[PDB]
Amino acid sequence: ITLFPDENKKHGLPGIGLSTSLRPRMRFSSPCYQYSPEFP
Amino acid sequence: GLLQMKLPEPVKLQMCLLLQYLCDCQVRHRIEAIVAFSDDFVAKLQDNQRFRYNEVMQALNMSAALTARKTREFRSPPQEQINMLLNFKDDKSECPCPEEIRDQLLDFHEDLMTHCGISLQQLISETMVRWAQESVIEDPELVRAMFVLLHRQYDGIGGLVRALPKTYTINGVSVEDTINLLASLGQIRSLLSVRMGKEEEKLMIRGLGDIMNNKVFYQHPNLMRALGMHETVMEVMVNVLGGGESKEITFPKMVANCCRFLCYFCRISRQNQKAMFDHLS
Amino acid sequence: PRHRAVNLFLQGYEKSWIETEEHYFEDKLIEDLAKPGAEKRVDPLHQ
């Protein structure tokens, strides 16, 4: 992962790009009640 | 054209929060790029410094200059070594032996400044000043969010200086352990908000037990403090025993568990002891 | 190790190359914030 997607100073649309940071895993129990009910 | 429409105060507040989220994601991407370049640069610097220290050691004659280099490389603690290797911020200010890495780091700093404020920020600032000039705003919370967002657009360096202390790099081997640790920490933080009861204390005890059993706690005290749930455990402590200070102390088992967790956290590392000293009073 | 080295470099890079830049924007920001703008009512800085 780099900062500028192109050799140009174009920043790119925010929120669009590769992200590697650790994040909580999404899990929804189907309606022990461990997690919230699943949704489409 | 959603920004350009004549929005009411709640709607414009929600889109201020949306723009704040966009700024946060952009800062996160910046930190990711910084981490990547930091990895590459520190690899180059480490190998070069070890090679040059070996070369200095190969000198047949040992003198005052030789012992100066010995203190330069070996005696100084690693943080002092990093600060020494990064002292070349000014132009030719007692720079280390390499200079190609100096050029590379200067180029990276320049492009990082370019990516920072030094076209989303201009748009956000223009919309904010336009809305402020449109009419008098009655919501203090809306005004506060407006001005904090405007300030964060005008100062992108503040995000860096407030986020780099909290950033950390973990090895790819312990990714699952880090994820489990973060999940347990999230559970503890979530249970902090709700009212206290027996089921709550059982869940906190189970979470703390998982925290002890996790090997990341032993390996990375620096990350442990950076996440900083010693503060959250102290918050749980004060919540439990605020009434008990006056009278009728509750949850003796959980206060004992919190004491054990804090003692173990202090014992793992020296700097953790200093971090916990502030709550001595 | 590699992770320790990169963490130390992150902290050092902060304290050296990020905490020393002083870009002057206060005057321009105050000017544009106190500019009354087109239409009187209260200026943003007065708000």
Side-chain angles (χ1 to χ4, degrees), chain B residues 38-39 86 109 134 169, chain C residues 2-3 7 9 17 21 41:
Chain B
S38 174
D39 183 20
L86 294 175
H109 176 255
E134 286 306 341
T169 64
Chain C
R2 293 294 301 104
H3 70 279
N7 286 328
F9 184 89
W17 256 267
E21 291 71 25
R41 54 220 171 288

Side-chain angles (χ1 to χ4, degrees), chain B:
Chain B
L2 195 48
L3 278 170
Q4 287 71 13
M5 311 175 6
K6 189 186 60 180
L7 324 175
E9 288 199 359
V11 174
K12 73 180 56 183
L13 180 50
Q14 308 296 336
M15 328 177 31
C16 292
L17 314 177
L18 153 64
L19 304 176
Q20 186 172 1
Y21 178 89
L22 304 177
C23 298
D24 299 348
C25 89
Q26 183 175 6
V27 173
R28 180 173 293 268
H29 147 77
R30 297 177 176 180
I31 300 176
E32 294 288 6
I34 297 175
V35 167
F37 174 85
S38 174
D39 183 20
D40 192 12
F41 193 90
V42 77
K44 307 171 180 301
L45 177 53
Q46 178 178 0
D47 64 62
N48 188 15
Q49 95 82 19
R50 283 150 143 80
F51 153 72
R52 77 161 188 262
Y53 148 73
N54 300 355
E55 173 183 0
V56 170
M57 172 47 39
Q58 294 331 290
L60 176 62
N61 304 356
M62 192 86 197
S63 182
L66 277 301
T67 190
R69 313 292 105 68
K70 188 64 167 300
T71 303
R72 154 100 159 192
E73 310 289 351
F74 187 93
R75 263 60 185 176
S76 58
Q79 41 166 7
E80 263 76 11
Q81 306 169 353
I82 305 302
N83 306 344
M84 190 217 107
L85 289 157
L86 294 175
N87 61 6
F88 67 101
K89 220 299 182 183
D90 304 0
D91 300 0
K92 305 180 181 302
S93 46
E94 200 66 19
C95 65
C97 299
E99 179 275 344
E100 310 76 11
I101 75 165
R102 301 183 60 191
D103 184 13
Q104 179 186 354
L105 179 55
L106 261 296
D107 296 344
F108 170 80
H109 176 255
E110 160 56 23
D111 61 56
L112 181 55
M113 301 335 287
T114 302
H115 195 280
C116 273
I118 303 183
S119 62
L120 178 55
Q121 51 178 357
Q122 321 79 327
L123 166 68
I124 297 183
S125 57
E126 177 178 359
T127 57
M128 221 74 57
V129 299
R130 169 190 64 177
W131 293 356
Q133 294 173 0
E134 286 306 341
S135 62
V136 48
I137 303 168
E138 290 75 352
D139 183 22
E141 180 61 18
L142 175 55
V143 175
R144 285 195 164 271
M146 227 173 192
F147 277 97
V148 300
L149 188 62
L150 180 59
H151 176 268
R152 86 190 290 100
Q153 309 304 326
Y154 268 76
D155 180 16
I157 313 296
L160 296 179
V161 281
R162 294 179 276 95
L164 290 180
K166 285 180 291 293
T167 194
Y168 194 87
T169 64
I170 55 103
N171 285 320
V173 55
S174 59
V175 287
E176 70 296 332
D177 300 347
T178 303
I179 294 175
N180 303 346
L181 170 83
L182 293 175
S184 180
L185 178 52
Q187 301 166 8
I188 303 301
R189 289 203 178 103
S190 304
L191 297 171
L192 182 54
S193 185
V194 307
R195 197 196 68 172
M196 191 85 218
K198 300 308 176 181
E199 180 57 43
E200 312 293 342
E201 74 168 358
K202 289 184 293 184
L203 302 163
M204 311 215 149
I205 291 176
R206 183 268 326 178
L208 296 179
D210 309 343
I211 289 304
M212 321 295 208
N213 298 353
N214 189 204
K215 305 331 290 184
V216 183
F217 205 107
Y218 310 77
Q219 296 188 356
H220 317 84
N222 298 354
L223 175 57
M224 264 330 316
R225 180 164 37 88
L227 299 179
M229 80 305 288
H230 58 287
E231 312 163 0
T232 68
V233 170
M234 271 285 298
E235 192 28 69
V236 177
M237 202 157 225
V238 305
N239 171 12
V240 168
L241 68 87
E245 285 167 346
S246 63
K247 43 71 182 181
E248 196 302 328
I249 174 59
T250 52
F251 314 103
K253 186 178 305 179
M254 162 111 84
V255 59
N257 284 115
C258 296
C259 296
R260 302 194 315 177
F261 172 85
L262 295 174
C263 296
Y264 162 68
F265 175 82
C266 297
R267 287 186 267 94
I268 64 171
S269 178
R270 288 291 294 271
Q271 43 269 11
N272 292 7
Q273 222 182 0
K274 205 183 52 53
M276 191 56 28
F277 190 109
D278 58 357
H279 317 107
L280 176 60
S281 59

